[PDB]
Write a protein that binds this ligand. Sequence first.
Ligand SMILES: [Cl-]
Ligand SMILES: [Cl-]
Ligand SMILES: [Cl-]
Ligand SMILES: [Cl-]
Ligand SMILES: [Cl-]
Ligand SMILES: [Cl-]
Ligand SMILES: [Cu+2]
Ligand SMILES: [Cu+2]
Ligand SMILES: [Cu+2]
Ligand SMILES: [Cu+2]
Length: 129
Amino acid sequence: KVFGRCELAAAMKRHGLDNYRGYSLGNWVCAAKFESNFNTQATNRNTDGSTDYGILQINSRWWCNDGRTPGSRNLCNIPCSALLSSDITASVNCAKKIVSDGNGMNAWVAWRNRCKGTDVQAWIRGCRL
Ligand SMILES: [Cl-]
Ligand SMILES: [Cl-]
Ligand SMILES: [Cl-]
Ligand SMILES: [Cl-]
Ligand SMILES: [Cl-]
Ligand SMILES: [Cl-]
Ligand SMILES: [Cu+2]
Ligand SMILES: [Cu+2]
Ligand SMILES: [Cu+2]
Ligand SMILES: [Cu+2]
């Protein structure tokens, strides 16, 4: 599923990401925009052989099991395919664990490089949530 901007904002807020760990809703929408372009089916191979999955490009090196990432963990206790669903629950639950792991949203390199410090409220402008 490719979410609309406002549609995703609404869904993220319904799933409790708004202000989760102090990160406003616009931070999460911004991250999803630059990680996946709001596409729940996005997958991308990394240099280390892991793969990123879903709307928030969660990495198989720590967070999910894809069966092909040697030496990796599965800290969200899910198959990486669960992160590609039209239903964003598994991605949200796993993101909540990631953003609580010590470095906040810096875990998402694209959030650090493209969202951090910007006017992220723009991402929820005009939205019926
Ligand atoms: Cl957009
Ligand atoms: Cl915001
Ligand atoms: Cl593996
Ligand atoms: Cl392994
Ligand atoms: Cl959803
Ligand atoms: Cl609402
Ligand atoms: Cu709330
Ligand atoms: Cu990544
Ligand atoms: Cu893994
Ligand atoms: Cu709502």
